[PDB]
Nucleic acid binder design. Structure first.
Lengths: 247, 57, 92
RNA sequence: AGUAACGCAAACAUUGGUGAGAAUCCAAUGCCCCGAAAACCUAAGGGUUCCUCCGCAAGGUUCGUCCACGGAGGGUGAGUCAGGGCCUAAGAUCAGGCCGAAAGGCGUAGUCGAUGGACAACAGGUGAAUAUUCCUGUACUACCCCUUGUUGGUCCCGAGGGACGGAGGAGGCUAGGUUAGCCGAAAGAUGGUUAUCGGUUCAAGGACGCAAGGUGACCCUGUUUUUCAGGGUAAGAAGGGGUAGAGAAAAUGCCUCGAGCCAAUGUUCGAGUACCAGGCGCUACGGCGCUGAAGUAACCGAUGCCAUACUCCCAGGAAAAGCUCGAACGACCUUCAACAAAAGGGUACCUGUACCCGAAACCGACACAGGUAGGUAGGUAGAGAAUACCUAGGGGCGCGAGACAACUCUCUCUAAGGAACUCGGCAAAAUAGCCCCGUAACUUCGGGAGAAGGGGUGCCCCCUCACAAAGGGGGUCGAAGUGACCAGGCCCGGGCGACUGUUUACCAAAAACACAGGUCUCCGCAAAGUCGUAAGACCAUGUAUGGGGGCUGACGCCUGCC
RNA sequence: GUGAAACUAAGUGGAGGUCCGAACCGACUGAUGUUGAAGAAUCAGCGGAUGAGUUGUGGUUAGGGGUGAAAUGCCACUCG
RNA sequence: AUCCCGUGUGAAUCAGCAAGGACCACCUUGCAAGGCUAAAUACUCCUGGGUGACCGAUAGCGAAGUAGUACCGUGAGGGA
RNA sequence: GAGUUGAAAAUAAGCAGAGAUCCGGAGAUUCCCGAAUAGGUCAACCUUUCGAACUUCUGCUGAAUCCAUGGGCAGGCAAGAGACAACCUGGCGAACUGAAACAUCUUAGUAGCCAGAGGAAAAGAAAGCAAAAGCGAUUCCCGUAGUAGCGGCGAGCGAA
């Protein structure tokens, strides 16, 4: 059933790239209208069951989304995990048992479990590990934190009272869906990127002269002068919540 | 193809949204332009159109 | 209160008739007659200023602007009143 | 220097007329051109160039009696057409709020903002200049009055809906076209002939209704499941209807009734005492006046409707108001006040309306061999909107006349040879349509490929006939049969780039850029990175299968040492 | 064809950054034209032509900048 | 040194504090950390008088008539 | 005090020796746009509940919050907005140039831009100069004086 009156309509126009109008997120423009899907990240209805009726293709995501009803009269969309049998029932809550598809706070669960949709603090919608196959595991918990290995090879002790939708998120087969039509990159609203050697010295620092120019500078740099290999772009004192980068 | 000719058959509504009296009076700069037009003595300080009628001639 | 669209000095809402030969064609052929009115006028203000100063039920009021600035009004009266017997009284 | 030129090589010629004066203005007759226009209408722009009369000082690359020129006068008529009085997109302005030497920057409500959504008129006539606008016919919208009921009603709020993609081909039909029937006329000095020439038109809307079209759920039987023949189900359609939960509507869950439904098309009214061929009477010979026949059928067939109908695909396809339904809460007014209808009358808001609009009037300084969104798409031959010639309609390109030198340019042919020319087959010449046979190296097994190469082709007979295309056999002409226009030249090697694309508007289209793919590296969301003193914005209403940035460039083998 | 697979005739279907070719978009070669008809065109062919398309209308980024499938290209016949 | 600000520290009331060109002692001078005031003074889009070894239509105001006009540019603006 | 209805003639009608035309003082009107102001606007237009919109003042009612604040309603000849050639003040604030280059410096706190305000503005009534002698707010002119100085002790800058 399309036109759910949950597709939410008005957006900012397409894959935009304008802050004041200047190109500030490069190589954007083109494609369809790509009307977004307002899905239910933060499940505000706990301890009421809900079935799964439709796996709809969200063009905003890499994965799919699904339409879930309730015993009461509502309709939401959530990220369906791998193993979403059609007609299967999901239910958020604090003491709900672990099933591939439902949500629960990060305390009342064991350790060593596949979870996609976790929260980094209370009250937010949903932040981490919600791509098309992004799976986060749990190392053991602590007094008010929880060491969580999220899908970067990166561990992070986190606030333990955060909602989390247990399951491995589906549509993994976009690892191998080839874009071999070679203009299908432009259908996603992604213009072609030019390369730094073949620009001019007014544009990029590697604006060369005769021939295929070697990179010339002591380090390969960005078009704004910063070295683009190894230089960690991270503020030295923000949180200190991560245990080891492990990367 | 076309020629290297610049002005064309654009509607005077859109020429009056850019060069008309409203966007000329919506800035300090444009009203300073009207200080220079009224200070010089031009009979037509803007190039505009009318939402109702065309021309009384 | 019943406001008009604009308060426009109702004893000057009509200016002059038109004495061309096509106006006499509209009299003998249309039961209509030709007036010159100012731009700030209506199909509601002219139409009221004919049924009062003349004493005639007016059928329709077809107005047009003229590019020298002033407005032209073809007023068509009712079938009950000949425009020829009411135009010779004015001087057409 | 009285020199080049007079703005395509569609082409004019004559007889009359006007005048002082005519290649040029007008009229007639032929001739010729466009005809997916060089035709008609509208968006933009222009602004009076539109029309009558007068004039020829300047303009018209000549003349001029003419004019888009000069002067005087006139002309643009809307409840229904297009915008505003309705709504929102991109975007703009942003009350408060944050920020900032000033100016102002960010940003919410709100308000503007059509290229979109909503909303009611068509046919004939008139007319020096106006026609969905003026007249006449039939309509339709939005309110008031006149009759029945109701005591609540309007707005805000809750909801449905508005509401949307691309491609594909098959149906059912209309618009147009051809033919036939019917009606009227016709002797068009030629050998014959009526086989010829013109009409055969009608809209919006009001009523009634839809199949051999699509849709209507499952199983068996007969047929190619299919069009249909036949049985059963109690839900299995368009649609209604009850409930249950905090549940008025809605949504969800459960139960029940309905075999039909949908829309172009269609018959009738509108609609004939209209239109129309023709004849009948005067010419200011520019046209008016009276009367008036038939007004049907079939084959094609739309790029238009059904139709946002189905099928497939990913790259997943605006918003708000009008409209419909509805409880509580909140603001106002209340009885002859408010609401809902049924016939019948009354009332009808501003602006645009001329003219040019494939252009002499717009944009190119020009009456400039150029450009300009959209709509209508006739006949024959053809697959066709190419092409060739034409109907409608509109023109003859605003210098002509002699002559027939060199030489330039646009074309045609050329004995004998065939690239010997040349930087280089540059350019020209040649191939060309449909069917049949046949087609190699190599390969990513998709292709190359229409490879290459060869044959038939016009027109009259017959038969087989899917009984429409088409086949075989035969004859007939020409030197030549896709006889005109139109309409692939190909093969063998190599270098580069995988490829389709993009690039220096006005000397470079490439081997350059991009690309799918690969790899390194940064980034855990109060992300990195980018623009901004700042607030903040893009990133992103996305979350490492994601977002930057560097290099290389499909694919196959690999990518060594320091 | 085997108890199911793997795979293949045959139809149906209409995919393509497919092919030929009009409108349309662009400008590869040649000639003309160089006080040109035209401050970039005409003529004869030419490349794409269902897409990484073309175009109208309303907008957006403005010069210690914008934008750039990257040429120092374009930003009102002007752009290190 | 005097005078005024940015960050941070941070006094004394007349037996005092500040200045007298680092600074100290004595003397002299004045009383910051609160405000307001006419005149002499600088100029002409002008106005009213008087002048000019200033101009006389290429001059003098761009402009002696439609003058910031016709015209050019999208516009800022240029300009007879 | 004698003719008038502008330039600007003509024509048609007037107005005037109980005093016109004209001149002067004070008043009245002043459509529409423009601060533009009821709301929108593509200036001289549209829609209109015909409205000085907004800020400020006054008055009532008075949220989360008791007093408050915000808001709403109302009154008001109603204070401000807008314009202004040059001078003046306040803030941002160059560069070509000179130094025979150029960076300190100069040009220059000039031009320009924004804001404000008056016929003038700024400043201004000694926590001041001076030197053992004395003056008595600020501003401007002549002078000291091109002096003392300052300065890649260069170019220059230059008081009291």
């Amino acid at each position: 059933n399309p036109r759910n009156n949950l597709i939410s309509g008005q957006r900012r126009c397409g894959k935009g790239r304008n802050a004041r109008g200047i190109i500030t997120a490069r190589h954007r423009g083109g494609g369809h209208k790509r009307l977004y899907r307002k899905i239910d990240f933060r499940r505000n209805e706990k301890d009421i069951y809900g079935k799964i009726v439709t796996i709809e293709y969200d063009p905003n995501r890499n994965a799919y989304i699904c339409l879930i009803h309730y015993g009461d009269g509502e309709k939401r969309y959530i990220l369906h995990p791998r193993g979403a049998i059609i007609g299967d029932t999901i239910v958020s809550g604090t003491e709900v048992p672990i099933k591939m598809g439902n949500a629960l706070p990060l305390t009342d669960m064991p350790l060593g479990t596949a979870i996609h949709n976790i929260e980094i603090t209370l009250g937010r919608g949903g932040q981490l590990a919600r791509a098309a196959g992004a799976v986060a595991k749990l190392i053991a918990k602590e007094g008010k934190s929880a060491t969580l290995k999220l899908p970067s090879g990166e561990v992070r002790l986190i606030s333990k009272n955060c909602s989390a939708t247990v399951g491995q998120v589906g549509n993994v087969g976009v690892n191998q869906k080839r874009l071999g039509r070679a203009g299908s990159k432009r259908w996603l609203g992604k213009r072609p990127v030019v390369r730094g050697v073949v620009m001019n010295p007014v544009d990029h620092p590697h604006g060369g002269g005769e021939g295929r120019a070697p990179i010339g500078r002591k380090s390969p740099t960005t078009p704004w002068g910063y070295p683009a290999l190894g230089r960690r772009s991270r503020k030295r004192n923000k949180y200190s919540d991560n245990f080891i980068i492990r990367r | 193809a076309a020629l290297c000719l610049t002005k064309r058959s654009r509607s005077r509504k859109s020429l009056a949204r850019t060069h008309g009296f409203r966007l000329r009076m919506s800035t300090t700069s444009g009203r300073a332009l009207l200080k220079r037009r009224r200070a010089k003595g031009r009979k037509i300080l803007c190039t505009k159109t009318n939402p109702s009628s065309g021309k009384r001639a | 209160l019943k406001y008009p669209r604009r308060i426009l000095d109702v004893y000057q809402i009509l200016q002059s008739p038109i004495i061309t030969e096509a106006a006499i064609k509209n009299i003998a052929d249309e039961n209509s007659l030709l007036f010159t009115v100012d731009v700030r006028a209506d199909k509601k203000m002219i139409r009221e200023a004919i049924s009062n100063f003349f004493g005639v039920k007016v059928r329709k009021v077809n107005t047009l602007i003229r590019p020298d600035g002033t407005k032209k009004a073809y007023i068509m009266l009712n079938k009950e009143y000949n425009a020829s017997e009411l135009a010779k009284k004015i001087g057409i």
